[PDB]
Amino acid sequence: QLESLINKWSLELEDQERHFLQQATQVNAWDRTLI
């Protein structure tokens, strides 16, 4: 039981990390367009 909660929450945080990278990419396009 415990091992499977740790493995699951690891994958749930690696998914939020990908969410931040895809947000940073979108800001970077508006940044260029404003320059």
């Binding site: 740790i6 690891s10 939020q16 931040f20 940073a24 970077n28 260029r32």
Partner: protein, 99 residues
């Protein structure tokens, strides 16, 4: 990962602004990844939890004291190397968007 990434420089964001005429972002136009690579730097882990093999239906049930030590190691790595770094991702993207 396809690449052996070395660690990046310490934080391109203790800039206090200065006016005259031109934008500080003309330096960050030259390289296409400049803001994405900054977020990919602040997100960077030095330690993770390993991936754990599911225990067998034949194994001995462990003394509870070590499960608490294993979980206290696990949530701390998450608080120190993921949650804190994702709140720093947010504070950085907030400050970028406001500018």
């Amino acid at each position: 990962l396809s690449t052996v990434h070395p660690a990046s420089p310490p934080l391109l964001c203790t800039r206090e602004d200065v006016e005259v005429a031109e934008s500080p972002l003309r330096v960050l136009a030259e390289t296409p990844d400049s803001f994405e690579k900054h977020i990919r730097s602040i997100l960077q882990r030095s330690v993770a939890n390993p991936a754990f093999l599911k225990a067998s239906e034949k194994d001995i049930a462990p003394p509870p004291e070590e499960c608490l030590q294993l979980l206290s190691r696990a949530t701390q790595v998450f608080r120190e190397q993921y949650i804190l770094k994702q709140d720093l991702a947010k504070e950085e993207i907030q400050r970028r968007v406001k500018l």
